[PDB]
Amino acid sequence: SALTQPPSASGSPGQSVTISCTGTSSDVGGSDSVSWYQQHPGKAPKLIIYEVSQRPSGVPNRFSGSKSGNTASLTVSGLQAEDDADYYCSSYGGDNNLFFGGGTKVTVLGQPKAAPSVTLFPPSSEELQANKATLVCLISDFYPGAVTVAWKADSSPVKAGVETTTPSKQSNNKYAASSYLSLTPEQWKSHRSYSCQVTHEGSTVEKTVAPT
Amino acid sequence: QSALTQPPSASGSPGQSVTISCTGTSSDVGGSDSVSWYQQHPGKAPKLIIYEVSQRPSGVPNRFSGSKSGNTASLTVSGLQAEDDADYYCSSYGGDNNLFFGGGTKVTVLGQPKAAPSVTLFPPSSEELQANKATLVCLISDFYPGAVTVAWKADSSPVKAGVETTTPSKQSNNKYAASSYLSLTPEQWKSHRSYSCQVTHEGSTVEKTVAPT
Numbered sequence: 001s002a003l004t005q006p007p008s009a010s011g012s013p014g015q016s017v018t019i020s021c022t023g024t025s026s027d028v029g030g031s032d033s034v035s036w037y038q039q040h041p042g043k044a045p046k047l048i049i050y051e052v053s054q055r056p057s058g059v060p061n062r063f064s065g066s067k068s069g070n071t072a073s074l075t076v077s078g079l080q081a082e083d084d085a086d087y088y089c090s091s092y093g094g095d096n097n098l099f100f101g102g103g104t105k106v107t108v109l110g111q112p113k114a115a116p117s118v119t120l121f122p123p124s125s126e127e128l129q130a131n132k133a134t135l136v137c138l139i140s141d142f143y144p145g146a147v148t149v150a151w152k153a154d155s156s157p158v159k160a161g162v163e164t165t166t167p168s169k170q171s172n173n174k175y176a177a178s179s180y181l182s183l184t185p186e187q188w189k190s191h192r193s194y195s196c197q198v199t200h201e202g203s204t205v206e207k208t209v210a211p212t
Numbered sequence: 213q214s215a216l217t218q219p220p221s222a223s224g225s226p227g228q229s230v231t232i233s234c235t236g237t238s239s240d241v242g243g244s245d246s247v248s249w250y251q252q253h254p255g256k257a258p259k260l261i262i263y264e265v266s267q268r269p270s271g272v273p274n275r276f277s278g279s280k281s282g283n284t285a286s287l288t289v290s291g292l293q294a295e296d297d298a299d300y301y302c303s304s305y306g307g308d309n310n311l312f313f314g315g316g317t318k319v320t321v322l323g324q325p326k327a328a329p330s331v332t333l334f335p336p337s338s339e340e341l342q343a344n345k346a347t348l349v350c351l352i353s354d355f356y357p358g359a360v361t362v363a364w365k366a367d368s369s370p371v372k373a374g375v376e377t378t379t380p381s382k383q384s385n386n387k388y389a390a391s392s393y394l395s396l397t398p399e400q401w402k403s404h405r406s407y408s409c410q411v412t413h414e415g416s417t418v419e420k421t422v423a424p425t
């Protein structure tokens with residue numbers, strides 16, 4: 001996305017959260033045109049801040065917007081249950097364009113936080129004999145149910161062939177998901193290693209495997 | 213602040229067209245050409261697909277056409293593809309810096325192709341065994357529709373404890389994926405001749421088997 005938002009934030013009821021929205025001098029830093037939008041999953045989004053700091057009618061004053069340089073910030077004071085939602089920012093850009101952030105998932109904690117268990121599996125022998133070298137990164141027992149996964153070939157980001165499942169609540173009431181990277185046997189055997197990077201509650205865990 | 217009016221649902225078969233409407237008032241949809249449309253796959257960031265009533269941003273296929281008559285904007289999606297199955301929202305700026313949104317239309321692409329799961333069973337990784345853990349993962353991908361049941365075997369016998377299977381989720385190929393993981397101790401893993409994962413989808417079952425080495 002043109003603007004950078006942290007993928008997630010959290011707080012317990014009554015706490016405050018600040019989520020950021022970083023651009024460049026030619027968009028976020030070039031005018032006072034930042035807006036913020038709130039979306040509960042599967043419902044229409046809602047404008048909650050415009051022109052950096054302005055609340056539309058009916059938006060409570062615990063939502064506030066500010067800006068400094070090329071970073072805009074939304075602060076939600078006194079978190080309430082209804083504040084659990086995804087939040088997007090936007091700014092006017094260059095050449096009559098509109099730039100959006102990628103969204104921050106705000107969780108109002110409903111249970112204790114729990115860091116993921118991460119396990120990275122190299123290609124199984126059966127799939128290698130079938131000309132497939134899919135890797136799986138298993139991520140379990142975490143809360144909140146927000147996680148961002150990145151893969152690396154050696155040290156280079158890998159975007160192609162990545163899929164990650166939507167975290168789902170398991171029998172222990174914590175979340176699990178899997179990310180799998182669809183590699184050919186040639187790709188697997190010819191790199192020094194591949195890594196799975198799991199960020200949760202702003203903490204990027206990394207696991208690495210290599211051919212044996 | 214009033215919503216714009218969108219039908220909650222619309223549908224079409226692959227290759228077919230669908231037109232969905234967005235009715236506002238004279239001071240929003242009817243008052244200027246600032247009507248936008250957004251596509252959103254459940255659980256994902258949306259994508260603006262139309263701005264200024266009719267303009268597609270870069271990368272939006274020309275299968276998406278926007279128009280307006282009076283207070284009603286319309287989106288037509290031609291040549292429906294599986295990837296078009298999504299929620300579609302409209303918006304319009306009005307006066308007083310207000311931005312109005314429709315409630316969303318879920319467009320269903322009917323009759324999408326059935327697909328059997330690709331099932332890949334992974335034995336415990338070296339790292340986790342050194343950490344005194346022997347979790348197995350059965351990756352189940354590229355199936356459709358998105359219902360699956362999973363059963364595990366220790367040698368030939370059913371496993372009744374330690375199984376978790378994630379809720380199937382639709383991936384970028386518009387087919388579902390899930391993982392089942394069996395949380396064994398290294399002792400349980402080493403004390404059996406093999407472990408198997410059986411996936412059942414639309415009455416057909418696929419079984420994979422792994423063993424210590």
Ligand SMILES: CC[C@]1(c2ccccc2)CCN(c2cc(C)n(CCN3CC4(CCN(c5nccn6cncc56)CC4)NC3=O)c(=O)c2)C1
Pocket residue numbers: 001002003037039044045088096097098099100101102103250252257258259260261263269270301
């Ligand atoms: C307003 C309600 C939002 C919403 C939230 C929840 C559900 C539904 C909608 C808030 C978050 N929204 C996003 C959020 C995101 C991430 N992306 C994708 C990222 N992109 C696409 C783009 C590309 C350039 N472009 C334009 N090209 C030419 C001329 N234009 C004039 N105006 C724009 C352009 C379109 C926008 N810029 C940008 O950063 C979106 O598209 C829209 C829309």
